[PDB]
Structure 1
Amino acid sequence: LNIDSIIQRLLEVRGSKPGKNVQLQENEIRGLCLKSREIFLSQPILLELEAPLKICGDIHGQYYDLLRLFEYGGFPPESNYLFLGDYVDRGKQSLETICLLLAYKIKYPENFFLLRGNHECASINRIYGFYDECKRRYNIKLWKTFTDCFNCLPIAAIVDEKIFCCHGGLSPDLQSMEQIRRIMRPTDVPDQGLLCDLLWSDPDKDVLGWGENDRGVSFTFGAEVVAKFLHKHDLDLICRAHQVVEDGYEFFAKRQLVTLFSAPNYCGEFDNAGAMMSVDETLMCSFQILKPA
């Protein structure tokens, strides 16, 4: 598996017009999936990271925007990265997107991190795009290999014991960090329960406690759930993605939670910007805005 050749080929499309594909050999892609899976399983399901690091929200196959993110934040290993999930579906180039991210994870396993989003699930990416892309450019077996890889992704992370990071949000069933640590991999996402909530919930300013989620699954949570959560676990901030917000990021409950979305002009219809959060050693935050290009 020649990782450097793969990364160089994927980056060659830089400074080009969005849409240009990178056609890697099938065995290479299969290789990235099997190699990265091995690494995912050797690292905790609940990551313990240290700043400085850049945190990114949803990408959704918008490969040319991912390149722009690395451009503004610095290509690995110049900066440590933590992605919050949702690399595939919706966008037209999920393959290049996930391949580049997997290649970086393989080359810099200790300085590059990827969490699971609700779209890194076979039943979801079967509907929203990834499956069609895989079938059109390669074949179904390749999609199945991607599924095996996805089922081994870590679920959450905690930066310097103070910043909790997950894709969707909190769960009424989450009473101890121990619960997340005991989830065994490989695994798929259940239709309810802790694992489901961590990938599917959203914060709601108008709810008291727990509420129904319009996505048709999981719950919504209020500002008080956040405050209580942070306090009992002695954390300072909750960082998540999952929800498209017009400015790329949005603070919730007096800056106790931040939502990050890194795909500008999502689905080609919303006119939202994308954002990336930088956390330094003192844990002070800075946000880079990516205007839709």
Structure 2
Amino acid sequence: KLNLDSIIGRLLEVQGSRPGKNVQLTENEIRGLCLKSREIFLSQPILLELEAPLKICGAIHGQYYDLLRLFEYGGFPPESNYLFLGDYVDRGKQSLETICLLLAYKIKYPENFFLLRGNHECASINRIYGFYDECKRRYNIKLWKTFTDCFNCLPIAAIVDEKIFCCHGGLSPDLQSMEQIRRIMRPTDVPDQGLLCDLLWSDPDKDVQGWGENDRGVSFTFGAEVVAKFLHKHDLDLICRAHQVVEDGYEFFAKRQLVTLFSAPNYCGEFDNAGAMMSVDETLMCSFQILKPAD
């Protein structure tokens, strides 16, 4: 058996810590979490269809202490259903505590808690924003190569109540029909180009019309009209998305028909932003709760 509650215990036990205490687990515990959660992700749809109420959250980037305080106010699983919009690893102090806690809850409550693939959930990039090094030191590279094979199987996007479309990055020029998503096979890496890539990498931009280029050097920007076009075609009312720090934690775009969510406050210590999450009520009335740092 996998002692799932022992793992979750030790992970949560550090909540009241000052300073930021580390959590110590074994390779065969964490190797367990990956191999056990991998099955779950391959069983559930590549494009999730879900039902309200649920709380939706943006990037976390290993900001483990902040993740805990999100749960502290939003309520721990399964008392609130959750959907997370990717970007779990890299940059923050504690990628491993972060991804392990989320993989743990995804095994503990497999129908009450969901994880979408961010852009950082691929090898080639967490090689260079530091997750590979957090592994190389605290455990070993052999562990990291397992986490990669976990990430290569996460779901891409979610539609809540057939009306809110969520994914990590945004739209694509090639995203014409949902079946193109459902036809992507897993496991897969994130390629440099095309639908899968664009879903993870793209951005809204008010200064652009149609499919503009992107400073990130992969995939596109998209303008306020392109949202309006997409919503109608699929009978949606909202796009929700992450992938980009914004000061308010929630930033509306395109006439309040798209929103970008960033959950990590005071990101990397480099920015003065609030972090935020979106509580979807059962009636599909959204609301926001904002984890705002002190000035």
TM-score range, shorter chain: over 0.9
**Deviation of the 1:130 alpha carbon:** 0.5
- Return 5+ residue gaps in structure 1 as ranges: none
**Deviation of the 1:292 alpha carbon:** 2.4
1:207 aligned residue: 208
Q: Distance in 1 between matches of 2:105 and 2:18?
A: 23
1:2 aligned residue: 3
**Deviation of the 1:18 alpha carbon:** 4.8
Q: Greater CA deviation, 18-27 or 214-223? A: 18-27
Aligned positions, number: 293
Q: Distance in 2 between matches of 1:220 and 1:18?
A: 40
**Deviation of the 1:254 alpha carbon:** 1.5
Q: Distance in 2 between matches of 1:48 and 1:200?
A: 22
Q: Distance in 1 between matches of 2:286 and 2:18?
A: 32
**Deviation of the 1:105 alpha carbon:** 0.2
**Deviation of the 1:15 alpha carbon:** 1.3
Q: Distance in 2 between matches of 1:255 and 1:174?
A: 21
Q: Distance in 1 between matches of 2:9 and 2:19?
A: 17
Deviations 1:125-178 (A, max 9, x none): 010011000011000010000000000000001000000000000000011000
Q: Distance in 1 between matches of 2:187 and 2:231?
A: 29
Determine helix, strand or coil for the equivalent of 1:134.
Answer: helix
Determine helix, strand or coil for the equivalent of 1:287.
Answer: strand
Go from structure 1 to structure 2 and tell me whether the alpha carbon gap of 1:273 and 1:18 turns closer, same or farther (over 3 Å shift).
farther
Determine helix, strand or coil for the equivalent of 2:88.
Answer: coil
**Residues 111-122 of structure 1 mapped to structure 2, 5 A cutoff:** 111-122=112-123
Determine helix, strand or coil for the equivalent of 2:169.
Answer: coil
1:234 aligned residue: 235
Determine helix, strand or coil for the equivalent of 2:83.
Answer: strand
2:283 aligned residue: 282
Deviations 1:189-226 (A, max 9, x none): 00010000000000000101110111111000001110
The sequence identity of aligned pairs, in percent, is 98
Go from structure 1 to structure 2 and tell me whether the alpha carbon gap of 1:98 and 1:230 turns closer, same or farther (over 3 Å shift).
same
Go from structure 1 to structure 2 and tell me whether the alpha carbon gap of 1:32 and 1:212 turns closer, same or farther (over 3 Å shift).
same
Q: Distance in 2 between matches of 1:100 and 1:18?
A: 19
Q: Distance in 2 between matches of 1:205 and 1:18?
A: 41
Deviations 1:270-292 (A, max 9, x none): 00010010001111111001012
Determine helix, strand or coil for the equivalent of 2:22.
Answer: coil
**Deviation of the 1:267 alpha carbon:** 1.4
Superposed structure 1 runs of 4+ greater than 2 Å apart: none
Go from structure 1 to structure 2 and tell me whether the alpha carbon gap of 1:18 and 1:235 turns closer, same or farther (over 3 Å shift).
farther
**Deviation of the 1:247 alpha carbon:** 0.9
CA contact (8 A) 1:189 1:196 kept: yes
Q: Distance in 2 between matches of 1:63 and 1:180?
A: 31
Determine helix, strand or coil for the equivalent of 1:275.
Answer: strand
CA contact (8 A) 1:125 1:131 kept: yes
Determine helix, strand or coil for the equivalent of 2:287.
Answer: strand
Q: Distance in 2 between matches of 1:101 and 1:152?
A: 15
With normalisation by structure 1, the TM-score equals 0.99
Determine helix, strand or coil for the equivalent of 2:99.
Answer: helix
Deviations 1:77-128 (A, max 9, x none): 1100000000000101000000000000000000000000000000010100
With normalisation by structure 2, the TM-score equals 0.98
CA contact (8 A) 1:18 1:64 kept: no
CA contact (8 A) 1:57 1:241 kept: yes
- Return 5+ residue gaps in structure 2 as ranges: none
CA contact (8 A) 1:88 1:98 kept: yes
CA contact (8 A) 1:58 1:260 kept: yes
**Deviation of the 1:55 alpha carbon:** 0.2
Q: Distance in 2 between matches of 1:72 and 1:228?
A: 36
Q: Distance in 2 between matches of 1:23 and 1:200?
A: 33
Deviations 1:52-77 (A, max 9, x none): 00000000000000000001100011
Q: Distance in 1 between matches of 2:186 and 2:229?
A: 29
Deviations 1:28-66 (A, max 9, x none): 000000000000000000000000000000000000000
Q: Distance in 2 between matches of 1:23 and 1:15?
A: 16
Determine helix, strand or coil for the equivalent of 1:217.
Answer: coil
- How well do the aligned residues superpose, as a CA RMSD in angstroms? 0.7
**Deviation of the 1:19 alpha carbon:** 2.4
Q: Distance in 2 between matches of 1:206 and 1:287?
A: 26
CA contact (8 A) 1:250 1:259 kept: yes
Q: Distance in 2 between matches of 1:245 and 1:252?
A: 12
Q: Distance in 1 between matches of 2:219 and 2:157?
A: 17
